[PDB]
């Protein structure tokens, strides 16, 4: 007895493994990511996060990709030495499982994920999707 859960927390494709897709978030208030490995990797895979702004030409087309900073909570001591949030799927992840993730403070209108340089050939074997939460507008 599954509901029409398309509406009431839909989702979109963020990273097919070959290219990213900026996705709007304004309609909702909360959101998170979902990572899926299609094959066994060879090293930890780092992905930088980026947010976009409505291009001045069209108020609902994403502009460039500004990199969102990193926010430490209470016991975070790593700080990623750059304060520019990025997420690294660790090596040895079984290709029948998933992992969650999110940024605690949003900024802009669109979200995009791009594999950090050097670890981009394993990105060809990963799929990242995004889910939202209840509707604001």
């Amino acid at each position: 007895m599954n509901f029409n859960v398309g509406v009431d927390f839909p989702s979109f494709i963020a990273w097919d493994g070959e290219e990213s897709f900026p996705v709007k978030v304004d309609g909702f208030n909360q959101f998170g990511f979902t990572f899926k490995t299609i094959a066994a990797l060879t090293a930890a895979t780092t992905f930088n996060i980026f947010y976009h702004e409505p291009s001045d030409a069209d108020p609902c087309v994403p502009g460039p990709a500004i990199r969102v900073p990193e926010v430490p909570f209470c016991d975070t001591v790593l700080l990623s030495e750059d304060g520019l949030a990025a997420v690294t799927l660790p090596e040895t992840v079984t290709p029948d499982s998933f992992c969650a993730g999110t940024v605690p403070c949003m900024n802009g209108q669109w979200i995009s994920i791009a594999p950090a340089t050097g670890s981009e050939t394993n990105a060809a074997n990963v799929q990242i999707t995004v889910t939202m939460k209840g509707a604001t507008r």
Binding site: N4, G6, V7, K24, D26, G27, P59, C60
Partner: peptide
């Protein structure tokens, strides 16, 4: 039986002139 219930995401402005009866003219 699948059924869709779809909705847009980008709103557009709603601008419109507010034309009014012009300067009074005489039929002659």
């Amino acid at each position: 039986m699948v059924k869709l219930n779809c909705r847009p995401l980008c709103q557009a402005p709603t601008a419109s002139r507010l034309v009014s009866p012009p300067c009074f003219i005489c039929r002659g």
